[PDB]
From Swiss-Prot, chain B:
GO terms for biological process: mRNA splicing, via spliceosome; RNA splicing; spermatogenesis; U2-type prespliceosome assembly. Changing residue 67 to K: No change in spliceosome assembly. It comes from the Eukaryota. Changing residue 14 to D: Results in defective spliceosome assembly. LRR repeats lie at residues 19-40, 42-63, 64-85, 88-109. This is U2 small nuclear ribonucleoprotein A'. It comes from Homo sapiens. Keywords: Acetylation, Isopeptide bond, Leucine-rich repeat, mRNA processing, mRNA splicing, Nucleus, Phosphoprotein, Repeat, Ribonucleoprotein, RNA-binding, Spliceosome, Ubl conjugation. Identified in the spliceosome B complex. Identified in the spliceosome C complex. Found in a pre-mRNA splicing complex with SFRS4, SFRS5, SNRNP70, SNRPA1, SRRM1 and SRRM2. Found in a pre-mRNA exonic splicing enhancer (ESE) complex with SNRNP70, SNRPA1, SRRM1 and TRA2B. Contributes to the binding of stem loop IV of U2 snRNA with SNRPB2. Belongs to the U2 small nuclear ribonucleoprotein A family. It is found in: Nucleus.
From Swiss-Prot, chain E:
It is linked to Cerebrocostomandibular syndrome: A syndrome characterized by severe micrognathia, rib defects ranging from a few dorsal rib segments to complete absence of ossification, and intellectual disability. The lineage of its organism: Eukaryota, Metazoa, Chordata, Craniata, Vertebrata. Residues 1-70 form the Sm domain. Belongs to the snRNP SmB/SmN family. This is Small nuclear ribonucleoprotein-associated proteins B and B'. Patients with the autoimmune disease systemic lupus erythematosus (SLE) have autoantibodies directed against some of the individual snRNP polypeptides. The most common autoantigen is called Sm. B/b' bear Sm epitopes. Plays a role in pre-mRNA splicing as a core component of the spliceosomal U1, U2, U4 and U5 small nuclear ribonucleoproteins (snRNPs), the building blocks of the spliceosome. Component of both the pre-catalytic spliceosome B complex and activated spliceosome C complexes. As a component of the minor spliceosome, involved in the splicing of U12-type introns in pre-mRNAs. As part of the U7 snRNP it is involved in histone pre-mRNA 3'-end processing. Methylated by PRMT5. The chain holds residues 4 to 87 of 240 of the full protein. It is found in: Cytoplasm, Cytosol; Nucleus.
From Swiss-Prot, chain H:
The keyword Acyltransferase does not apply. GO terms for cellular component: catalytic step 2 spliceosome; cytosol; methylosome; nucleoplasm; nucleus; P granule; precatalytic spliceosome; small nuclear ribonucleoprotein complex. One of its GO terms (molecular function) is RNA binding. This is Small nuclear ribonucleoprotein G. Signal peptide: none annotated. It comes from Homo sapiens (Human). GO terms for biological process: 7-methylguanosine cap hypermethylation; mRNA splicing, via spliceosome; RNA splicing; spliceosomal complex assembly; spliceosomal snRNP assembly; U2-type prespliceosome assembly.
UniProtKB/Swiss-Prot annotation, chain I:
Residues 5-84, 97-166 form the RRM domain. The keyword Transcription does not apply. This is U2 small nuclear ribonucleoprotein B''. Pfam families: RRM_1.
Amino acid sequence: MVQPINLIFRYLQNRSRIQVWLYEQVNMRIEGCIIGFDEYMNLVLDDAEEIHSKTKSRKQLGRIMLKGDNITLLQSVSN
Amino acid sequence: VKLTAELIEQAAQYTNAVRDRELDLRGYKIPVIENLGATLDQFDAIDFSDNEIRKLDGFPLLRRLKTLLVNNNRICRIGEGLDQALPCLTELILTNNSLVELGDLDPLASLKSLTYLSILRNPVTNKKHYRLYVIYKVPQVRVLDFQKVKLKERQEAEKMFK
Amino acid sequence: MKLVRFLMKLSHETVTIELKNGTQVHGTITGVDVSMNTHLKAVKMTLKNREPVQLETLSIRGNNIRYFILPDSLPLDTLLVD
Amino acid sequence: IPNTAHFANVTQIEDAVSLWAKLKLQKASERWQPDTEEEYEDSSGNVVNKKTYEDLKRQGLL
Amino acid sequence: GKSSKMLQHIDYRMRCILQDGRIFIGTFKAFDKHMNLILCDCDEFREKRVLGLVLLRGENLVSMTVEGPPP
Amino acid sequence: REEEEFNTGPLSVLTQSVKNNTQVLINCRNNKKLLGRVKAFDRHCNMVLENVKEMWTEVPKKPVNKDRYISKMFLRGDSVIVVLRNPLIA
Amino acid sequence: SIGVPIKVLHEAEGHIVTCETNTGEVYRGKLIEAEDNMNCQMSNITVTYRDGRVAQLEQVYIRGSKIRFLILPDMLKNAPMLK
Amino acid sequence: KAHPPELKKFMDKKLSLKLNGGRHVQGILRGFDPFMNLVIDECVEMATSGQQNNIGMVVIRGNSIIMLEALERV
Amino acid sequence: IRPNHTIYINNMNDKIKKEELKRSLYALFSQFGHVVDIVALKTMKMRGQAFVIFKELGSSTNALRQLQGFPFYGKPMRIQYAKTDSDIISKMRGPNYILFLNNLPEETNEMMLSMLFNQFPGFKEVRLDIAFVEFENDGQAGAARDALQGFKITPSHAMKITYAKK
RNA sequence: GGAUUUUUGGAGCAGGGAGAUGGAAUAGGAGCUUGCUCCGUCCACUCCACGCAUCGACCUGGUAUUGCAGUACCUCCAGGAACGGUGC
């Protein structure tokens, strides 16, 4: 049995780039490197980028504090 | 034993086989259907079988009334204000009644929501071209005497008496 | 401090409640619980682009109520003292 | 259930109804009920059939 | 205090309006802290839909009113 | 603990509205902005206000804007989206 | 700690019932597992949605978060549900 | 309180999960959580045109979980 | 087959909808009595057949006798008695005064005679190929004598019921 | 007792484009009635991209099943698409 909190801790220790999809919003997602987490699934992304699938654009913001109530799915990317 | 508010408040009401709120008013021998305002349109079907009602009239405004059981009665005339009191009346069972002429079916044409009508075991059904006259006078009815109305019967009703 | 104790002491008053779907129900507040369960008697409800309907009783939940409307002669200064 | 000395110091409902069923069975058993308890031999064959109750005899003699 | 708002309408036919615009008219038998309504032999109006015993959750409830006398 | 967090956090921005009797605006999720003086607040942002003015815009379903006034009202903290404090009472 | 509709849903496990979701999906079948948080796990279930896409699956699991209503048979509405 | 969901029988089984906004994924579950969070290793998501895209090990939260159908006989 | 409260009609039109056919069967059965339940399926095993369970057995017998071979949606349905008892009925359940019976089966017990006489209301007692049934009411005994004159019970023989003499 | 399955809400808003197309009986403004011209609100038809694909309910014709049960729904073929929702 693999826990999701242990997988999030392994992804934060590996410092790999992960993409987070929003809830009830399939057009725009976020992508970045998760540095830390909390009990409320609050992600701290360094040099994050908002990717819009409809317009095919990417806007960088930097240090972003994403709440866990909006992130619906999180996948690991190689970029 | 006339139909009053105390007889309607003491009558049994439950769910029928079609999952509709039906009140069983059978076994009362009411000579005239009246004092139906105590139900406050809370019943979807009316079970008035085995009664002595002579005219199907005197009913108040009930938008929830969709089925009316008038089987085993002596109904010989229909009221002209049936559409103003029951706009959502779709089921009308008038089997074994006292209807003899087709002219009593002329106030029944005002019910645009009526789709199922039963006029079996009546002397009006034994007359010549009774089904064609019922199809021509009431085009909104789809099932007449447990029989589906076809296009050929509608064409025969629209051809004659046009 | 707690708004539930202030809302529970507003019984026998003709108020109005506007929901999130645009339906406004005006009536006399008769029962208020800890979960803001508003039980009113002889209320009038008007939905979005619909006709107003009068009911003898109504029970609206606390999560479905968006805003409230109190009369101007309501003692809000005296009812705020716990 | 009638009030008798049998239903004394009994305070619960179901106990009372069960003891009433018991007393009913006992008394109804110990009476003499001629309708079901009787041996008639009808004159239909007049030398047979003594298993006739008190009701079948009237039906045969009617 | 008394909490008799839900106990007075017990074993009675009530019509509850949903958030999407549906209306379920059924006999309210029991409730809970999450306002879970159990409507035995309920009808769905918006057309008539035969449902029967429908256990609707309290999250999709908006308003409830009395429909008629108890059966 | 609770009083220090209410007087030192964001709720102090509400507590400056009831102590000094200032006017603040509340933008809700129904595209309506109500400007008024906050009279009673709570931990769940239950705002009971007096002398409120609510403005919005509506379509015939060109559209047009509209506004109205209420003597005393109460709004729950769920529908409150934005709360802005500005020196508008002076 | 356990509600009476929760107890009625737990007592109706093993009967042919249906669960209509908030999106309109109706999972129908035998209720194999029914927890206190309205978690309905069914075996040999059938999907009849408001979309109408009727299919048959071996196992389905619908949580109580997006569950709108539940249609149960009237075999348990008489006893011991009479209060 | 805080009872975990009954996900012991669906462990290491290929199931299809539905997420809000009309999302569909298919993969093998690798664990459970009391907050209904599921870890799907080697998951494949269905696009709008119908093509399947492999996203690898993903984590789906319980706030957007709609329905999980087991494609294997348990 | 013994008469029961549930009457099963078969050889009907299976092209109509299930709810419309159930409503038509309820409207047909409402003229003879109160219909308690209507069981109608459209599967491959129960295609084109349905049944109506009523409160009284006499209304179901009158509906089976009157609507025997009646045209229903173009096809003449055949009505008959049910083989087993209904679940709803099992859940809800749990001239002269003396009548002379002749040519009665010896294998029938007193419970079968009580179930046969239960179409009439409550009688005084029963006496047991000859039998004597005495009722408490004169009209009930007359209706039982008029109903059991040639009844369909144990069809290897014919049962005859007549009024007793003085 | 406002941080994922119930009560302090992730809800709000808008229905593709064109055509010397058609109508506001009593309800638009301006060129300061009436007639005409212009511009930010619908329905009916036609054209491109019957908006698209899906399944359920449903209507016509042909066709198969005669079977004793407590039910999401129940034969198949072809045409039409009045309805529902899903993703773009």
